[PDB]
């Protein structure tokens, strides 16, 4: 399923809820059309890898989550596992998500 985090507080709760499952976080800006437009692959993959938890984060409504990570550009995807960050990359490349997931699956 997809989970929307509107605050860092929920971000920590979500990381704990995923447990040992892979966790991908999208920092795309909802106000930015080019970034939101890429949400279908990110969101669609949630049903492709239902064994992986996908989080969507708004740098504008969830700037507390993004400010903590010092995001310098969007869209940015971050990978977390067991509450541990194991990967990150930027660029509107949806296929790239598939490779990193397979790499950490």
């Amino acid at each position: 399923m997809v989970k929307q985090i509107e605050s860092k507080t929920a971000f920590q709760e979500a990381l704990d809820a995923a447990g040992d499952k892979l966790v991908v976080v999208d920092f795309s800006a909802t106000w930015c059309g080019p970034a939101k437009m890429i949400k279908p692959f990110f969101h669609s993959l949630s049903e492709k890898y239902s064994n992986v938890i996908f989080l969507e984060v708004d740098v504008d409504d969830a700037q507390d989550v993004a400010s903590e990570a010092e995001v310098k550009a969007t869209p940015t995807f971050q990978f977390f596992k067991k509450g541990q960050k194991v990967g990150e990359f930027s660029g509107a490349n949806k296929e790239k998500l598939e490779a990193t997931i397979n790499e950490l699956v």
Partner: peptide, 13 residues
């Protein structure tokens, strides 16, 4: 200098 593939934070937001 502005790439559509990336949104710049320079935006007032």
């Amino acid at each position: 200098p502005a790439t559509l593939k990336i949104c710049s934070w320079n935006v007032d937001g």
